[PDB]
Amino acid sequence: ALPKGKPEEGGFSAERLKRLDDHMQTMVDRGQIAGGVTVLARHGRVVQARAFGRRVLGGDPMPMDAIFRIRSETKPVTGVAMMMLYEQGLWRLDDPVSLHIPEFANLRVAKGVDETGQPILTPVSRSPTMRELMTHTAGFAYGLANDPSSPADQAYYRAEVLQSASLTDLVQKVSGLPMFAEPGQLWRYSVAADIQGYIVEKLSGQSLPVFMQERIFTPLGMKDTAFYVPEEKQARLAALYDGDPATGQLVPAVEGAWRDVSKPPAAPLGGGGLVSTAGDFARFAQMILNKGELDGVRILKPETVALMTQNHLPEGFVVTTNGAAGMGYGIDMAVAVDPAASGAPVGPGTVSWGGSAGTWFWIDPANNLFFVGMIQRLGGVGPGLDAQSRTLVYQALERPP
Looking at the Cβ atoms of 196 and 277, the one nearer to Na ion is 277
CB of 389 to Na ion, least distance (A): 15
Q: How far is the CB of 378 from Na ion (least distance, A)?
A: 18
Indicate the burial class of 58 (C-beta count within 10 angstroms; 0-12, 13-18, 19 or more). exposed
Q: How near is the Cβ of 50 to Na ion at its closest, in Å?
A: 11
CA 295 vs CA 8, 164, 288, 354, 361: distances in Å: 23, 38, 13, 26, 21
Interface with Na ion includes 240 (CB under 5 A)? no
Residue from the set 17, 24, 27, 37 that interacts with Na ion by CB under 5 A = 37
x/- track of binding to Na ion for residues 58-87 (CB under 5 A) = --------x---------------------
Question: Number of residues in contact with Na ion, rule: CB under 5 A?
Answer: 4
Query: Which lies closer to Na ion via its Cβ, residue 164 or residue 276?
Result: 276
Nearer Cβ to Na ion, position 66 or 152? 66
Question: What is the C-alpha to C-alpha distance for residues 254 and 77, in angstroms, rounded to an integer?
Answer: 27
Q: Which stretch binds Na ion (CB under 5 A): 1-9, 32-40, 157-165, 361-369?
A: 32-40
DSSP state of 198: H
Residue 269 DSSP symbol: -
CB of 36 to Na ion, least distance (A): 9
Binding mask 1-30 for Na ion (x = CB under 5 A): ------------------------------
Strand-pairing partners, residue 293, are: 298
Pick the closer one to Na ion by CB: 134 or 374: 374
The string of DSSP letters for 104-160 reads GGG-EEEEEE-TTSPEEEEE-SSPPBHHHHHTT-S----SS---SSSHHHHHHHHHT
Q: According to CB under 5 A, which one of 170, 278, 285, 372 is a site residue for Na ion?
A: 278
Residue type at 114 in one-letter notation: D
By beta-carbon proximity to Na ion, the closer residue of 277 and 322 is 277
Supply the minimum distance, in Å, between the C-beta of residue 221 and Na ion: 14
Q: Which residues neighbour 287 within 8 Å (Cβ) at sequence distance 6 or greater?
A: 220, 293, 294, 299, 300
Comparing CB distances to Na ion, the nearer of 81 and 278 is 278
If the CB atoms of residues 277 and 389 are measured against Na ion, the closer one turns out to be 277
Of 277, 356, 367, 376, the one binding Na ion (CB under 5 A) is 277
Residue 381 C-beta: closest distance to Na ion, Å: 17
Q: Which of 277, 352 has the CB closer to Na ion?
A: 277
Neighbours of 10 (CB within 10 A): 23
The span of 33-41, 117-125, 182-190, 225-233 binding Na ion (CB under 5 A) equals 33-41
Question: Measured between alpha carbons, how far is 6 from 272 in angstroms, rounded to an integer?
Answer: 34
Closest CA to 108 of 128, 90, 93: 128
331-332-333-337 Cα dihedral, nearest 10 degrees:
30
Among left, alpha and beta (phi > 0; psi -120 to 50; other), residue 251 is beta
| C-alpha–C-alpha distance, residues 392 and 33, integer Å | 19
- Give the containing element (helix H, strand E) for 328: strand 327-329
Query: One symbol per residue from 200 to 239: x for binding Na ion (CB under 5 A), - otherwise; what is it?
Result: ----------------------------------------
Interface residues toward Na ion, by CB under 5 A: 37, 66, 277-278
